[PDB]
From a paper:
Human transthyretin (TTR) is a 55 kDa homotetramer that transports thyroxine and retinol-binding protein in the blood and cerebrospinal fluid. Wild-type TTR is inherently amyloidogenic and can lead to senile systemic amyloidosis (SSA). Native human TTR is known to be a homotetramer, or, more precisely, a dimer of dimers. The monomer consists of two four-stranded β-sheets, arranged in a sandwich-like tertiary structure in which β-strands HGAD are opposed to β-strands FEBC.
Author numbering:
A (entry chain B), B (entry chain B): 9 to 125
C (entry chain A), D (entry chain A): 10 to 125
Amino acid sequence: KCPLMVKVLDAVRGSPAINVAVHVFRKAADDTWEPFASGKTSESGELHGLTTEEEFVEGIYKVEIDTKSYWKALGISPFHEHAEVVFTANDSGPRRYTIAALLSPYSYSTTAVVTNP
Amino acid sequence: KCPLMVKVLDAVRGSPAINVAVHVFRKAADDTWEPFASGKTSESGELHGLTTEEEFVEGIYKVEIDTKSYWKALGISPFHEHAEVVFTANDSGPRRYTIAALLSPYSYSTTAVVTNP
Amino acid sequence: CPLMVKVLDAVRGSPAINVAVHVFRKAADDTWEPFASGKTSESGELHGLTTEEEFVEGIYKVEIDTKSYWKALGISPFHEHAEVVFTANDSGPRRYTIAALLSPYSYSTTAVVTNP
Amino acid sequence: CPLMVKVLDAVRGSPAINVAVHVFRKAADDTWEPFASGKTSESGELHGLTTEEEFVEGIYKVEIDTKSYWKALGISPFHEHAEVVFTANDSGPRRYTIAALLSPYSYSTTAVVTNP
């Protein structure tokens, strides 16, 4: 179904952060990051359809959010090159992961909401 | 329709914050707060149906979230008595307000997402 | 200092300077009584609000005037102010740092509580 | 100090003590080279990582070992670590404070940038 969803919000304008690039990677045996999935956030600041229950196996994942391009398109010089979220996916009953990020030019926060559907 | 919605998240457990009391007030002419609407967050940490476009007129509003009772039910001693969000509602084209709060025992953050439907 | 306030600006990556802060204490008749007030300095800090002797048990409210701050920068923000409400000194005297991180449509506030 | 890190614990309302921090600089061949490392003190701060002369223009990565921190408190947290990546000193030398506020399933990070 949809075990992984990303949501991005803009704290300066009080809006979804639209057309933000997101790349997802999975840690491979050799300790390097392999591309796993990517997309751009929608009008509601969300990114759905990244993966399926079948492919989303236990492992270490990295979500990379291209925040710098977002701010530059608004004419604001930002501090970070990108925002990175790194976590382990653990089976333990059925799980859905929502990775949220709240963006300002010199600060971001990120939260994980993990629920059972 | 639904011009005002509240969403509450628990940063300690990575979950919606369920059964949290929320009270909404409107500032009256005499500079005091009059009850306006209230409820408890649902299973998804959300509170819908607080008001309608007709009643939600321009004005100063206060959203009060009973965070202290939430933490005490989990057995954690919290710092704040409650979280308060105070803002002006301004007509200027059609607007929907989402007030989000992210809770920890000694810290909270709150964000407003304002969109046009 | 038993009570210190620190304010940061998340848009500019700087301390938030000249921000007005008002502190109140809940009185016997359940009203907010003015307790202390001041403005943040060039480091984003406000010291000297009170003393150990005056800072008795009670419920306190720290009100930060965020709206005037953003307006003076040309930004029309969402919140009227940020309010932090807490019970203080109920297990004996402590030192409190109230920190606030400001953006136009979002803020966060954290408390650091230390035993002298 | 050109580079300082400060870490707070949002669950306990305290500085986050004994947190391991590793700093890297992107080298010519696009790999991360170790630059400096240390542990936060009793005030949640890490000073002395570098000097003005050594801290040249570049892309730096500050990695904070949040997972070990929470595990030692008995809490199984979400993130493996917190990473902050930024270009430094590209318009001349500046002083950087990297602050992080930790909860088990959430963190925030802020930069304060000052011109000496």
